[PDB]
């Protein structure tokens, strides 16, 4: 299956079937976060997906071709996280991003807290373009979570 | 062995629930790809 869309990333090495993350299929390339797969090969039905590009520092990895996703947050509008939590239906959640201010520039961030296996779910703009992936962030004072909107370079 | 299975189309939902605030946070990204608050 290479149809564009969002996919669960599953393993059987633990008890039951376990969702370890999420990713995006677009233009025949599968996009997820590095910590989901650690760069390992993936099965899709009877076919195999071999990694093509990845970068631990960005926490990103692509399969079957180079990173395709290049939209970016406009810095002004709300976005939607299309969360795909383990064992639950995909659900859109709208929010206005905050900002990670870093020495090398600023990055949209979303203050939404989902289970760890939700890593790699796409964040979309109002045109439905994927502006980045959910799941690399920080834990704030009260103990909840803020994820960077992590995007690669096409 | 990891495997993938489709979970949906990628599309904006007009009736989406809305939540979450919009913090401005100073952060650093280390060579491990981990963010930390500054
Ligand atoms: N913690 C909250 N509220 N939600 C997280 C949601 C995480 C969404 C998916 N992203 C990740 O899984 C990535 C993997 C690492 C990327 C490395 N590039 N993880 C992080 O981005 C932070 C970044 C921290 C970097 C600091 N330098 N790591 C964690 O949260 C680890 C952590 C796990 C569990 C607790 C507390 C902390 C206790 N809570 C609980 O068990 C509630 C249920 C589990 N909830 C959670 O796992």
Q: By alpha-carbon position, which residue is closest to atom 16 of ligand 1?
A: A136
What is the distance between the alpha carbons of residues A134 and A115, in angstroms, rounded to a whole number?
Answer: 11
Whether A1-69 and A70-154 share one fold: the answer is yes
Q: Hey, what are A55's tokens?
A: 């970068």
Q: What is the resolution of this structure in A?
A: 2.0
Neighbour count for residue A128 (Cβ, 10 Å): 15
Q: Identify which of A111, A117, A94, A115 has the alpha carbon closest to the alpha carbon of residue A145.
A: A111
User: Measured between CB atoms, does B11 come within 8 Å of chain A?
Assistant: yes
Q: Please state, as a whole number, how many other Cβ atoms lie within 10 Å of the Cβ of residue B4.
A: 23
What whole-number distance in Å separates Cα of residue A3 and Cα of residue A104? 36
A139 lines ligand 1 (CB under 6 A): yes
| CB proximity under 8 Å: A 14-33 to B | 20, 22-26, 30
How many CA atoms lie less than 13 Å away from A141 in the CB half-sphere? Answer: 3
Any chain B CB within 8 A of the CB of A46?
no
**Ligand 1 pocket, residue A145 CB under 6 Å:** yes
Which of A62, A83, A96, A139 has the alpha carbon at shortest distance from B35?
A139
**Burial of B30 by CB count in 10 Å (0-12 exposed, 13-18 middle, 19+ buried)?**
exposed
Q: Under CATH, what is the fold of the domain A70-154?
A: Thrombin, subunit H (2.40.10)
**Structure solved using which method?**
X-ray
Q: Which residues pair with A81 in a beta bridge?
A: A93, A123
DSSP secondary structure letters along A58-115: TTEEEESSS--------SSS-EEEEE--TTS--EEEEE--EEEEETTEEEEEE-----
Helix, strand or coil for residue A147? Answer: strand
**In chain A, domain spans:** 1-69, 70-154
Q: Is the dihedral of CA A18, A24, A30, A32 positive or negative?
A: negative
Ligand 1 pocket residue status of A77, Cβ below 6 Å: no
Q: Let me know: does A147 contact B30? Beta carbons within 8 Å.
A: no
Helix (H) / strand (E) element for A37: namely helix A34-37
Report which of A59, A41, A75, A74 is spatially closest to residue A134, judged by C-alpha positions: A59
Cα separation, A122 vs A55, in Å, equals: 18
CATH for A1-69, options being 3.40.50.1820, 3.40.50.970, 2.102.10.10, 2.40.10.120: 2.40.10.120
Phi-psi label, residue B29: left if phi above 0, alpha if psi -120 to 50, beta otherwise: beta
């Amino acid at each position: 299956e290479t149809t564009d869309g969002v996919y669960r990333v599953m393993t059987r090495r633990l008890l039951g079937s376990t969702q370890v993350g999420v990713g995006v299929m677009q233009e025949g390339v599968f996009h997820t976060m590095w910590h989901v797969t650690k760069g390992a090969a993936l099965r899709s039905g009877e076919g195999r997906l071999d990694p093509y590009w990845g970068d631990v520092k960005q926490d990103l990895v692509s399969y079957c071709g180079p990173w395709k996703l290049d939209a970016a947050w406009d810095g002004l509008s709300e976005v939607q996280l299309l969360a795909v939590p383990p064992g639950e239906r995909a659900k859109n959640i709208q929010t206005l991003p905050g900002i990670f201010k870093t020495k090398d520039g600023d990055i949209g961030a979303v203050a939404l807290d989902y289970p760890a296996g939700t890593s790699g779910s796409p964040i979309l703009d109002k045109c439905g373009r994927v502006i980045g992936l959910y799941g690399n962030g920080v834990v704030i004072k009260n103990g909840s979570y803020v994820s960077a909107i992590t995007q690669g370079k096409r | 062995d990891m495997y993938i299975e489709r979970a949906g189309d990628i599309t904006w939902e007009k009736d989406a629930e809305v939540t979450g605030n919009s913090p401005r946070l100073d952060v650093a990204l280390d060579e491990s790809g981990d963010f930390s608050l500054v």
